[PDB]
Coordinates of C-alpha atoms in Angstrom, one line a residue:
Chain R
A1 CA 29.7 -15.8 -164.3
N2 CA 33.0 -17.5 -165.4
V3 CA 32.8 -21.2 -165.9
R4 CA 34.4 -24.0 -168.0
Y5 CA 32.9 -27.4 -168.7
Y6 CA 34.3 -30.9 -168.5
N7 CA 33.7 -34.4 -170.0
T8 CA 34.1 -37.9 -168.5
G9 CA 32.9 -41.5 -169.6
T10 CA 33.2 -42.9 -173.1
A11 CA 31.4 -40.7 -175.7
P12 CA 31.8 -37.3 -177.2
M13 CA 28.9 -35.1 -177.9
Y14 CA 28.3 -32.2 -180.4
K15 CA 26.4 -29.0 -180.0
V16 CA 26.2 -29.1 -176.2
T17 CA 23.8 -26.7 -174.4
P18 CA 23.8 -26.9 -170.5
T19 CA 21.1 -25.4 -168.5
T20 CA 22.5 -24.0 -165.2
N21 CA 21.0 -23.0 -162.1
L22 CA 22.0 -20.4 -159.4
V23 CA 21.3 -20.7 -155.6
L24 CA 22.3 -18.3 -152.7
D25 CA 20.6 -19.5 -149.6
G26 CA 17.7 -21.9 -150.1
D27 CA 16.1 -19.7 -152.7
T28 CA 16.7 -19.6 -156.5
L29 CA 18.0 -16.6 -158.5
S30 CA 17.6 -17.9 -162.1
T31 CA 18.0 -21.0 -164.3
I32 CA 19.4 -20.3 -167.7
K33 CA 19.4 -22.4 -170.9
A34 CA 22.5 -21.6 -172.8
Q35 CA 22.0 -19.3 -175.8
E36 CA 24.1 -19.2 -178.8
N37 CA 27.0 -17.4 -177.2
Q38 CA 28.3 -20.1 -174.8
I39 CA 27.3 -23.1 -177.1
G40 CA 30.0 -25.7 -177.3
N41 CA 30.8 -27.4 -180.7
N42 CA 32.9 -30.4 -179.6
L43 CA 33.9 -32.3 -176.4
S44 CA 36.4 -34.9 -176.9
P45 CA 36.2 -37.2 -173.8
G46 CA 38.6 -36.5 -171.0
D47 CA 38.9 -32.8 -171.9
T48 CA 37.3 -29.4 -171.1
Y49 CA 35.5 -26.6 -173.0
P50 CA 37.5 -24.4 -173.8
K51 CA 41.1 -26.1 -173.8
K52 CA 43.9 -26.2 -171.4
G53 CA 45.6 -23.0 -172.4
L54 CA 42.8 -20.4 -172.6
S55 CA 40.5 -18.2 -170.4
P56 CA 37.2 -19.7 -169.2
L57 CA 33.8 -19.0 -170.6
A58 CA 31.5 -16.2 -169.3
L59 CA 27.8 -16.0 -169.3
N60 CA 25.9 -12.9 -168.4
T61 CA 22.4 -12.9 -170.2
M62 CA 19.1 -14.8 -169.9
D63 CA 16.8 -14.1 -172.9
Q64 CA 16.2 -16.1 -176.0
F65 CA 18.3 -13.7 -178.1
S66 CA 21.0 -12.2 -176.0
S67 CA 19.9 -9.0 -174.3
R68 CA 18.5 -8.0 -170.9
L69 CA 21.3 -8.6 -168.4
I70 CA 20.4 -10.7 -165.2
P71 CA 18.7 -8.8 -162.5
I72 CA 19.2 -8.8 -158.7
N73 CA 17.0 -6.8 -156.2
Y74 CA 18.3 -4.8 -153.3
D75 CA 18.1 -7.2 -150.4
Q76 CA 20.1 -9.9 -152.1
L77 CA 22.5 -7.2 -153.0
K78 CA 22.9 -6.5 -149.3
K79 CA 23.3 -10.2 -148.7
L80 CA 26.0 -10.5 -151.4
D81 CA 27.9 -7.5 -150.3
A82 CA 28.2 -9.2 -146.9
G83 CA 30.6 -11.5 -148.5
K84 CA 28.4 -14.7 -148.9
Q85 CA 29.0 -17.0 -151.9
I86 CA 26.5 -18.1 -154.5
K87 CA 26.5 -21.7 -155.9
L88 CA 26.1 -22.9 -159.5
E89 CA 24.7 -26.2 -160.7
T90 CA 23.6 -28.2 -163.8
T91 CA 20.2 -29.8 -164.2
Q92 CA 20.5 -31.4 -167.6
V93 CA 22.6 -31.5 -170.8
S94 CA 21.3 -32.1 -174.3
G95 CA 23.3 -32.4 -177.7
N96 CA 23.8 -34.6 -180.6
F97 CA 26.0 -37.5 -181.8
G98 CA 27.6 -38.8 -184.8
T99 CA 25.9 -41.1 -187.3
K100 CA 26.9 -41.7 -191.0
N101 CA 25.5 -43.4 -194.0
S102 CA 26.9 -46.5 -195.7
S103 CA 30.4 -45.1 -196.1
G104 CA 28.8 -41.7 -196.8
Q105 CA 29.3 -38.4 -194.9
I106 CA 28.6 -37.8 -191.2
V107 CA 25.2 -36.2 -190.5
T108 CA 24.4 -34.6 -187.2
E109 CA 20.9 -33.4 -187.5
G110 CA 18.0 -34.2 -185.1
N111 CA 20.1 -37.0 -183.8
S112 CA 19.2 -36.0 -180.3
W113 CA 20.9 -37.4 -177.1
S114 CA 17.8 -36.3 -175.0
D115 CA 15.6 -39.3 -175.8
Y116 CA 18.3 -41.9 -175.2
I117 CA 18.9 -41.1 -171.5
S118 CA 16.1 -42.7 -169.5
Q119 CA 16.2 -45.8 -171.7
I120 CA 19.7 -46.6 -170.8
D121 CA 19.5 -45.4 -167.0
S122 CA 16.9 -48.0 -165.9
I123 CA 18.9 -50.8 -167.5
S124 CA 22.4 -50.1 -166.3
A125 CA 24.2 -49.7 -162.9
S126 CA 26.7 -46.9 -162.2
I127 CA 30.4 -47.2 -161.3
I128 CA 32.6 -44.2 -160.6
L129 CA 36.4 -44.4 -160.2
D130 CA 38.1 -41.5 -158.5
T131 CA 41.9 -41.4 -159.1
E132 CA 43.9 -38.4 -157.9
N133 CA 44.5 -37.2 -161.4
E134 CA 41.0 -37.5 -163.1
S135 CA 37.7 -39.3 -162.8
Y136 CA 35.8 -42.1 -164.6
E137 CA 32.0 -42.7 -164.7
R138 CA 30.7 -45.6 -166.4
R139 CA 27.3 -47.2 -166.9
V140 CA 27.2 -51.1 -167.3
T141 CA 24.1 -53.1 -168.5
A142 CA 22.5 -55.5 -166.1
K143 CA 20.3 -58.7 -165.9
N144 CA 16.8 -59.1 -164.4
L145 CA 15.8 -62.4 -163.2
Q146 CA 12.1 -61.9 -162.4
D147 CA 11.5 -62.1 -166.1
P148 CA 12.8 -65.3 -167.7
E149 CA 12.4 -63.9 -171.2
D150 CA 14.8 -61.0 -170.6
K151 CA 17.9 -62.9 -171.9
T152 CA 21.4 -61.4 -171.5
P153 CA 24.6 -62.9 -170.0
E154 CA 24.9 -62.4 -166.3
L155 CA 28.5 -61.5 -164.9
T156 CA 29.8 -60.6 -161.6
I157 CA 31.4 -57.5 -160.1
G158 CA 34.9 -58.4 -160.8
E159 CA 34.2 -59.0 -164.3
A160 CA 32.1 -55.9 -164.6
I161 CA 35.1 -53.8 -163.5
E162 CA 37.3 -55.8 -166.0
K163 CA 35.2 -54.7 -168.8
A164 CA 34.4 -51.3 -167.7
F165 CA 38.0 -50.2 -167.8
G166 CA 40.5 -52.3 -169.9
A167 CA 42.4 -54.2 -167.1
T168 CA 45.1 -56.8 -167.4
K169 CA 44.6 -59.8 -165.1
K170 CA 48.2 -60.1 -163.8
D171 CA 48.8 -62.9 -161.4
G172 CA 45.3 -63.3 -160.3
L173 CA 45.0 -59.6 -159.5
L174 CA 44.3 -56.9 -162.1
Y175 CA 45.7 -53.5 -162.9
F176 CA 44.6 -50.3 -164.7
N177 CA 47.6 -48.5 -166.4
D178 CA 49.9 -49.9 -163.8
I179 CA 47.9 -49.1 -160.7
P180 CA 46.7 -52.0 -158.4
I181 CA 42.9 -52.3 -158.4
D182 CA 42.5 -55.3 -156.1
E183 CA 39.8 -56.2 -153.7
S184 CA 42.4 -55.6 -151.0
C185 CA 44.1 -52.4 -151.9
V186 CA 41.3 -49.9 -153.0
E187 CA 38.7 -48.1 -151.0
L188 CA 35.1 -49.0 -151.9
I189 CA 32.3 -46.7 -150.9
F190 CA 28.7 -47.9 -151.5
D191 CA 25.4 -46.5 -150.2
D192 CA 22.7 -48.1 -148.0
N193 CA 20.7 -49.8 -150.9
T194 CA 23.8 -51.2 -152.5
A195 CA 25.5 -52.2 -149.2
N196 CA 22.2 -53.6 -147.9
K197 CA 21.9 -55.8 -150.9
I198 CA 25.6 -57.1 -151.2
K199 CA 26.2 -57.7 -147.5
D200 CA 22.9 -59.6 -147.5
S201 CA 24.0 -61.6 -150.5
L202 CA 27.5 -62.6 -149.2
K203 CA 26.4 -65.1 -146.5
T204 CA 24.9 -67.2 -149.3
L205 CA 28.3 -67.8 -151.0
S206 CA 31.2 -70.0 -150.0
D207 CA 34.1 -67.5 -151.0
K208 CA 33.6 -64.4 -148.9
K209 CA 34.9 -62.0 -151.5
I210 CA 32.9 -59.2 -152.9
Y211 CA 34.4 -58.9 -156.5
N212 CA 32.9 -62.3 -157.3
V213 CA 29.3 -61.7 -156.0
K214 CA 26.6 -61.3 -158.7
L215 CA 25.6 -58.1 -160.5
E216 CA 22.1 -56.7 -160.1
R217 CA 20.0 -54.0 -161.8
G218 CA 20.1 -50.7 -159.8
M219 CA 23.4 -49.9 -158.1
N220 CA 25.8 -47.0 -157.5
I221 CA 29.3 -47.9 -156.6
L222 CA 32.3 -45.5 -155.9
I223 CA 36.0 -46.8 -155.9
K224 CA 38.9 -44.7 -155.0
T225 CA 42.5 -45.5 -154.9
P226 CA 44.5 -44.2 -151.9
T227 CA 47.5 -42.0 -152.0
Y228 CA 50.0 -43.8 -149.9
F229 CA 50.3 -47.6 -150.3
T230 CA 52.3 -50.1 -148.4
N231 CA 52.6 -53.3 -150.5
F232 CA 55.5 -55.2 -149.0
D233 CA 56.8 -57.0 -152.2
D234 CA 57.2 -53.7 -154.2
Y235 CA 55.6 -50.4 -154.7
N236 CA 55.6 -48.6 -151.3
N237 CA 55.5 -45.1 -152.8
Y238 CA 56.7 -43.3 -149.7
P239 CA 59.3 -40.6 -148.7
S240 CA 59.4 -42.1 -145.3
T241 CA 61.6 -45.3 -145.5
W242 CA 60.0 -47.5 -143.1
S243 CA 61.7 -48.3 -139.7
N244 CA 62.4 -52.0 -138.6
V245 CA 61.4 -53.5 -142.0
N246 CA 60.6 -57.1 -141.7
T247 CA 61.8 -59.2 -144.6
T248 CA 60.2 -62.7 -144.5
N249 CA 57.5 -63.8 -147.0
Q250 CA 56.3 -60.4 -148.1
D251 CA 54.6 -61.4 -151.3
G252 CA 50.9 -60.6 -150.7
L253 CA 48.6 -62.5 -148.4
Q254 CA 49.5 -66.1 -147.5
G255 CA 52.8 -64.6 -146.3
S256 CA 51.9 -64.1 -142.7
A257 CA 55.3 -65.2 -141.6
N258 CA 56.7 -62.3 -139.7
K259 CA 55.8 -62.0 -136.0
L260 CA 57.9 -59.4 -134.3
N261 CA 57.5 -57.3 -131.1
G262 CA 58.2 -53.6 -130.7
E263 CA 57.4 -50.5 -132.7
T264 CA 57.7 -49.1 -136.3
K265 CA 57.6 -45.4 -137.1
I266 CA 56.7 -43.1 -139.9
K267 CA 57.0 -39.3 -140.1
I268 CA 55.4 -37.6 -143.1
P269 CA 55.9 -33.8 -143.9
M270 CA 53.3 -31.4 -145.3
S271 CA 55.0 -30.9 -148.6
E272 CA 53.6 -34.2 -150.2
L273 CA 50.1 -34.3 -148.7
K274 CA 47.5 -31.7 -149.2
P275 CA 46.2 -30.0 -146.0
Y276 CA 42.7 -29.1 -144.7
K277 CA 41.3 -32.6 -145.1
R278 CA 39.9 -35.6 -143.1
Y279 CA 42.0 -38.6 -144.3
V280 CA 41.0 -42.2 -143.8
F281 CA 43.4 -45.0 -142.8
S282 CA 42.8 -48.6 -143.6
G283 CA 44.4 -52.1 -143.1
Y284 CA 44.0 -55.8 -142.6
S285 CA 44.6 -58.1 -139.5
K286 CA 46.6 -60.9 -138.0
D287 CA 46.7 -62.9 -134.6
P288 CA 49.4 -61.1 -132.4
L289 CA 49.4 -60.7 -128.8
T290 CA 48.5 -57.0 -128.5
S291 CA 49.3 -53.6 -130.4
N292 CA 48.4 -50.1 -130.8
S293 CA 48.9 -47.4 -133.3
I294 CA 49.5 -43.8 -132.1
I295 CA 48.7 -40.6 -134.0
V296 CA 50.5 -37.5 -132.6
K297 CA 49.4 -34.9 -135.0
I298 CA 48.1 -31.6 -133.6
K299 CA 45.1 -29.4 -134.6
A300 CA 43.1 -32.8 -134.8
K301 CA 42.6 -35.6 -132.3
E302 CA 46.0 -37.2 -131.2
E303 CA 44.9 -40.3 -129.4
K304 CA 45.6 -43.9 -130.4
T305 CA 43.4 -46.9 -130.8
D306 CA 42.9 -50.4 -129.5
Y307 CA 43.9 -53.2 -131.9
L308 CA 41.7 -56.0 -130.5
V309 CA 42.0 -58.8 -133.1
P310 CA 39.0 -61.3 -132.8
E311 CA 40.8 -63.8 -135.0
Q312 CA 43.8 -64.2 -137.4
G313 CA 41.3 -63.7 -140.2
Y314 CA 42.4 -60.7 -142.5
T315 CA 39.9 -58.1 -141.3
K316 CA 39.9 -54.5 -142.6
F317 CA 39.9 -51.5 -140.3
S318 CA 39.7 -47.7 -140.9
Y319 CA 40.2 -44.5 -138.9
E320 CA 40.3 -40.8 -139.4
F321 CA 42.3 -37.8 -138.5
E322 CA 42.7 -34.1 -139.6
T323 CA 45.6 -32.3 -141.1
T324 CA 47.6 -29.1 -140.1
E325 CA 48.0 -26.1 -142.3
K326 CA 51.3 -26.1 -144.2
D327 CA 53.5 -26.0 -141.0
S328 CA 57.1 -27.3 -140.5
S329 CA 55.7 -30.1 -138.4
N330 CA 55.3 -33.6 -139.7
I331 CA 52.6 -36.2 -139.0
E332 CA 54.1 -39.0 -137.1
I333 CA 52.4 -42.4 -136.8
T334 CA 53.9 -45.1 -134.5
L335 CA 52.9 -48.8 -134.4
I336 CA 53.6 -50.2 -131.0
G337 CA 52.9 -53.7 -129.7
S338 CA 54.0 -57.3 -129.2
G339 CA 53.3 -60.1 -131.6
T340 CA 53.5 -59.3 -135.2
Chain H
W1 CA 21.4 -72.9 -193.0
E2 CA 21.0 -74.9 -189.9
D3 CA 23.2 -72.7 -187.5
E4 CA 22.4 -69.5 -189.0
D5 CA 18.8 -68.4 -187.9
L6 CA 19.2 -65.1 -186.4
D7 CA 16.0 -63.6 -185.0
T8 CA 16.9 -59.9 -184.8
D9 CA 18.6 -58.5 -187.8
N10 CA 21.6 -57.6 -185.8
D11 CA 23.7 -59.2 -188.7
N12 CA 25.1 -61.7 -186.3
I13 CA 25.1 -65.4 -186.1
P14 CA 23.1 -66.8 -183.0
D15 CA 25.4 -69.8 -183.2
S16 CA 28.3 -67.4 -182.6
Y17 CA 26.5 -65.7 -180.0
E18 CA 25.2 -67.9 -177.1
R19 CA 28.4 -69.8 -177.1
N20 CA 31.8 -68.6 -175.7
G21 CA 32.0 -65.6 -178.0
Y22 CA 32.5 -64.1 -181.4
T23 CA 35.4 -62.2 -183.0
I24 CA 35.5 -59.6 -185.7
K25 CA 37.7 -60.6 -188.7
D26 CA 37.5 -58.9 -192.2
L27 CA 34.2 -57.2 -191.2
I28 CA 32.7 -60.6 -190.6
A29 CA 31.9 -62.1 -187.2
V30 CA 33.6 -65.5 -186.8
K31 CA 33.7 -68.1 -184.0
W32 CA 36.0 -68.0 -181.1
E33 CA 39.1 -70.2 -180.2
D34 CA 41.3 -69.9 -177.2
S35 CA 44.5 -69.1 -179.1
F36 CA 43.6 -65.6 -179.8
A37 CA 44.4 -63.7 -176.6
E38 CA 48.0 -63.8 -177.7
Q39 CA 47.1 -61.5 -180.7
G40 CA 45.1 -58.9 -178.8
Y41 CA 41.7 -60.2 -179.9
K42 CA 38.9 -59.9 -177.2
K43 CA 35.9 -62.2 -176.4
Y44 CA 32.4 -61.2 -175.7
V45 CA 28.7 -62.2 -175.8
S46 CA 25.4 -60.5 -175.8
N47 CA 21.7 -61.2 -176.2
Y48 CA 20.5 -62.0 -179.6
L49 CA 16.7 -61.3 -178.9
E50 CA 17.5 -57.6 -179.2
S51 CA 18.8 -55.4 -182.0
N52 CA 20.2 -52.9 -179.5
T53 CA 21.5 -54.8 -176.4
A54 CA 22.9 -51.8 -174.6
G55 CA 20.5 -48.9 -175.4
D56 CA 22.8 -46.5 -177.2
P57 CA 21.6 -46.5 -180.9
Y58 CA 24.6 -48.3 -182.2
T59 CA 23.8 -51.9 -183.2
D60 CA 25.8 -55.0 -182.3
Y61 CA 27.7 -55.5 -185.6
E62 CA 28.3 -51.7 -185.7
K63 CA 29.9 -51.7 -182.3
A64 CA 31.8 -55.0 -182.3
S65 CA 33.8 -53.8 -185.3
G66 CA 35.2 -50.4 -185.6
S67 CA 32.8 -49.0 -188.1
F68 CA 31.0 -46.0 -186.2
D69 CA 33.4 -43.4 -185.0
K70 CA 37.1 -43.1 -184.0
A71 CA 36.9 -40.7 -181.2
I72 CA 34.9 -43.1 -179.2
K73 CA 37.1 -44.6 -176.4
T74 CA 38.4 -48.0 -177.1
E75 CA 37.0 -49.3 -173.7
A76 CA 33.5 -49.3 -175.3
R77 CA 33.7 -51.9 -178.1
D78 CA 32.2 -54.9 -176.6
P79 CA 28.4 -54.6 -176.6
Chain N
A1 CA 8.6 -18.9 -157.9
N2 CA 10.7 -21.9 -157.1
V3 CA 9.1 -25.1 -158.0
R4 CA 10.0 -28.8 -158.8
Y5 CA 7.9 -31.4 -160.5
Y6 CA 6.6 -34.9 -159.9
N7 CA 5.5 -37.9 -162.1
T8 CA 3.4 -40.7 -160.7
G9 CA 2.3 -43.0 -163.6
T10 CA 3.5 -45.5 -166.2
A11 CA 5.2 -43.6 -168.9
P12 CA 8.2 -41.1 -169.2
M13 CA 7.7 -37.9 -170.8
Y14 CA 10.1 -36.2 -173.2
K15 CA 10.2 -32.5 -173.7
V16 CA 7.9 -31.8 -170.7
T17 CA 6.1 -28.6 -170.5
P18 CA 3.6 -27.5 -167.9
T19 CA 1.5 -24.4 -168.0
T20 CA 0.6 -23.2 -164.7
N21 CA -1.6 -20.6 -163.1
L22 CA -1.3 -18.2 -160.1
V23 CA -4.1 -17.3 -157.6
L24 CA -3.9 -14.8 -154.9
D25 CA -7.3 -14.4 -153.3
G26 CA -10.2 -15.5 -155.5
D27 CA -8.6 -13.9 -158.6
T28 CA -6.1 -14.9 -161.2
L29 CA -3.0 -12.7 -161.6
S30 CA -1.5 -14.5 -164.5
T31 CA -1.2 -17.9 -166.3
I32 CA 2.2 -18.9 -167.6
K33 CA 3.0 -21.2 -170.4
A34 CA 6.6 -22.3 -169.8
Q35 CA 9.5 -20.9 -171.8
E36 CA 12.6 -22.7 -172.9
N37 CA 14.3 -21.9 -169.6
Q38 CA 12.1 -24.2 -167.4
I39 CA 11.6 -26.8 -170.0
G40 CA 12.6 -30.4 -169.0
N41 CA 14.1 -32.9 -171.2
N42 CA 13.9 -36.4 -169.4
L43 CA 11.5 -37.3 -166.7
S44 CA 11.1 -40.9 -165.8
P45 CA 8.0 -42.2 -164.1
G46 CA 8.3 -42.2 -160.3
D47 CA 10.9 -39.2 -160.1
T48 CA 11.1 -35.5 -160.3
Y49 CA 12.9 -32.5 -162.0
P50 CA 15.6 -32.1 -160.7
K51 CA 16.6 -35.1 -158.5
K52 CA 16.2 -35.5 -154.7
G53 CA 19.4 -33.7 -153.8
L54 CA 19.2 -30.3 -155.4
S55 CA 17.4 -26.9 -155.1
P56 CA 14.3 -26.3 -157.1
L57 CA 13.7 -24.5 -160.4
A58 CA 13.1 -20.9 -161.0
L59 CA 10.4 -19.2 -163.1
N60 CA 10.1 -15.4 -163.3
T61 CA 8.8 -14.4 -166.8
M62 CA 5.6 -14.5 -168.7
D63 CA 6.5 -13.5 -172.3
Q64 CA 7.2 -16.1 -175.0
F65 CA 10.8 -15.2 -175.4
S66 CA 12.1 -14.9 -171.7
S67 CA 11.8 -11.2 -170.9
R68 CA 9.1 -8.9 -169.3
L69 CA 8.9 -9.9 -165.6
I70 CA 5.7 -10.4 -164.1
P71 CA 3.7 -7.3 -162.9
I72 CA 1.5 -6.6 -159.8
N73 CA -0.3 -3.3 -159.0
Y74 CA 0.0 -1.3 -155.7
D75 CA -3.1 -2.8 -153.9
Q76 CA -2.2 -6.4 -154.5
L77 CA 1.2 -5.6 -153.3
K78 CA 0.1 -4.1 -150.0
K79 CA -2.5 -7.0 -149.5
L80 CA 0.2 -9.5 -150.2
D81 CA 2.6 -7.7 -147.7
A82 CA 0.1 -8.7 -144.9
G83 CA 1.3 -12.4 -144.8
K84 CA -1.1 -13.8 -147.4
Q85 CA 0.1 -16.5 -149.8
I86 CA -0.4 -17.2 -153.4
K87 CA -1.4 -20.7 -154.7
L88 CA 0.1 -22.5 -157.7
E89 CA -2.2 -24.5 -160.0
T90 CA -1.8 -27.0 -162.9
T91 CA -4.0 -26.3 -165.7
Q92 CA -2.8 -28.8 -168.3
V93 CA 0.5 -30.3 -169.6
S94 CA 2.1 -31.5 -172.8
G95 CA 4.9 -33.7 -174.0
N96 CA 6.0 -36.5 -176.4
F97 CA 6.1 -40.2 -176.4
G98 CA 8.7 -42.7 -177.9
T99 CA 8.4 -44.4 -181.2
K100 CA 11.1 -46.5 -182.7
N101 CA 12.2 -46.6 -186.5
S102 CA 13.8 -49.4 -188.5
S103 CA 15.8 -51.1 -185.8
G104 CA 17.4 -47.8 -185.2
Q105 CA 16.7 -44.2 -184.1
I106 CA 14.1 -44.0 -181.4
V107 CA 12.4 -40.9 -182.9
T108 CA 10.4 -38.4 -180.6
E109 CA 9.7 -35.5 -182.9
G110 CA 6.3 -33.8 -182.4
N111 CA 4.6 -37.0 -181.5
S112 CA 2.5 -35.1 -179.0
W113 CA 0.9 -36.5 -175.8
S114 CA -1.8 -34.1 -176.3
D115 CA -4.2 -35.9 -178.8
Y116 CA -4.4 -39.2 -176.9
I117 CA -5.9 -37.9 -173.6
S118 CA -9.6 -37.4 -174.4
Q119 CA -9.7 -40.9 -175.8
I120 CA -8.2 -42.7 -172.8
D121 CA -10.1 -40.7 -170.1
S122 CA -13.5 -41.6 -171.7
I123 CA -12.5 -45.3 -172.0
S124 CA -10.9 -46.2 -168.7
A125 CA -11.6 -45.9 -165.0
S126 CA -9.1 -44.4 -162.5
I127 CA -7.5 -46.1 -159.5
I128 CA -5.4 -44.2 -156.9
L129 CA -3.4 -46.1 -154.3
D130 CA -1.7 -44.0 -151.6
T131 CA 0.9 -45.1 -149.1
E132 CA 3.3 -43.1 -146.8
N133 CA 6.2 -42.3 -149.2
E134 CA 4.6 -42.1 -152.6
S135 CA 1.3 -42.5 -154.5
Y136 CA 0.3 -44.2 -157.7
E137 CA -2.5 -43.3 -160.2
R138 CA -3.5 -45.8 -162.9
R139 CA -6.2 -46.0 -165.6
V140 CA -7.6 -49.4 -166.6
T141 CA -10.2 -50.4 -169.3
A142 CA -13.7 -51.6 -168.7
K143 CA -16.6 -52.8 -170.7
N144 CA -19.6 -50.8 -172.1
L145 CA -22.4 -53.4 -171.6
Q146 CA -24.8 -51.7 -174.0
Chain L
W1 CA -1.8 -70.6 -172.7
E2 CA -1.2 -73.5 -170.5
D3 CA -1.0 -74.0 -166.7
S4 CA 2.6 -75.1 -166.8
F5 CA 3.6 -71.6 -168.0
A6 CA 2.7 -70.1 -164.6
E7 CA 5.5 -72.3 -163.1
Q8 CA 8.2 -70.6 -165.0
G9 CA 6.8 -67.2 -164.2
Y10 CA 5.0 -66.3 -167.4
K11 CA 1.9 -64.0 -167.4
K12 CA -1.4 -64.5 -169.2
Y13 CA -3.5 -61.9 -171.0
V14 CA -6.1 -61.3 -173.7
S15 CA -7.3 -58.2 -175.8
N16 CA -9.9 -57.0 -178.3
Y17 CA -9.6 -58.2 -181.9
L18 CA -11.7 -55.4 -183.3
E19 CA -9.0 -52.8 -182.8
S20 CA -5.2 -53.0 -182.9
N21 CA -4.8 -50.6 -179.8
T22 CA -7.2 -52.0 -177.2
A23 CA -6.1 -49.8 -174.4
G24 CA -6.0 -46.5 -176.5
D25 CA -2.3 -45.8 -176.0
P26 CA -0.6 -45.6 -179.4
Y27 CA 1.4 -48.8 -179.0
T28 CA -0.1 -52.0 -180.5
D29 CA -0.9 -55.1 -178.5
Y30 CA 1.9 -57.2 -180.0
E31 CA 4.3 -54.2 -179.2
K32 CA 3.1 -54.2 -175.6
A33 CA 3.1 -58.0 -174.9
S34 CA 6.5 -58.6 -176.7
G35 CA 8.2 -55.9 -174.8
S36 CA 10.3 -54.5 -177.7
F37 CA 9.4 -50.8 -177.5
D38 CA 11.2 -49.1 -174.7
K39 CA 12.6 -50.3 -171.4
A40 CA 11.9 -47.5 -169.0
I41 CA 8.1 -48.2 -169.3
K42 CA 7.4 -50.2 -166.1
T43 CA 6.8 -53.9 -166.7
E44 CA 3.4 -54.0 -165.1
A45 CA 2.0 -52.0 -168.0
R46 CA 2.8 -54.5 -170.6
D47 CA -0.4 -56.3 -170.3
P48 CA -2.9 -54.6 -172.7

């Protein structure tokens, strides 16, 4: 097998030894602890072993000292010759870290990372950013309230993200290397435990925002920035210059001061978006008379939707569609309707 | 003295700790004032009832200053 | 064999190693002590190795250094091919606990979980509570009245 | 121990003063009440 590692987070790790696991169809071929061949000396964070310019890394043996190549019986050979694919996973990763003396020399001997895992995990919560260029997973310490003796400062979600990645509080919002991470402009995926807690904590507060709700102990939160963003002050990163642009009070929110009838149009070719996927489309609300948004892209569903605003209150919404496969055709979305 | 009774030997002052924050200067933790975000200085607090408030084996005074490693990401200096 | 673990109790175990036993029909084919392939580093209480979303773990060898795949004679093969099943048994387990040094390195180095078992099981009593999703088994002290 | 400590959510427990390890586990009683040993131990096992 040919394979290269990666790294993400905050810290490096020396003398890494992954234990991998193979699976064909429900079964298990073998799980191999890494021998001395494919051991990795260093992993600087945000990189890969080996580096960007070389071949990947091969493993072929299973013993303690490397001999006795990995076996497969006859029936699984007939399964594999049919053209099926086998899958490769990790179970655990051990290594060491770097400690020093009082301005002495760095010693890395028995400073195992294996024993510091479960002590950290049951204290923190997990936050994973997914940008379109890399990824970022972090663990942030939490506060318990059933025990009064467990002193620690409690903070909210919007400060936890602020300290997780180094963000600059510009104009009440915040950025991360000049990308807008707002409550408004990012896609927030939770799971049922997390969502069950936070939406049942929202009704107790006056301000119905989700960045300023209180942290808890065990949570797993994923954030993801979109690709195509339509901020009306600046930064509409778009090859499609918008049709019938309204220019009246387009700062952020508080600027609901364009109420127009008619349609607007966007047409996007396949050269700048990647095919074969199920995109999501999200937005906020208003109090117009009526509207619809039409999708006319083939090899998918090409119907439209009902707008159906309950109030003026800025209510998000999300739909989905599928892409074509690198054709000459462009995905065209129209926004028809009277009122805004 | 009176405002220097640290419980854990985290080498940090509990008066500097429960309050608004503490800042590293000349490898000594000092109090915090509000004219320091113009310089690039941060602000952070923790719990003084523990020697390792986060879990990773670096202590509080170790992690507040830059005295442990250089390849550690700079996003992980507050405890 | 494909196999995962479980752990219902009050303590994690570092460097977990179970040594298991195979039985076919009244007899014992082999008893494996686990090699460094199927060792487990971290295992928190109320969890499993690996997590709840992955395929199980393999074991196929019986030697100390992982070679020498497990043998079966002719007649046991022909009896096994008539639809019978083998059963997997736990004989005993071993691991390590966590001690902490001078406000520093939590050291777990040969501090074995083996030599504290015969004391605790002859001192406490055993309580098992079971519900529909998981169980719990605890040991709690009681007084010799004599 | 006082009755007012149960209002703030504190527990209450005793031990044997003829050994330092009254539950046999290799942690001491002061290590187990004052929870300064390891966090992934569940909090209901802190009482000795």
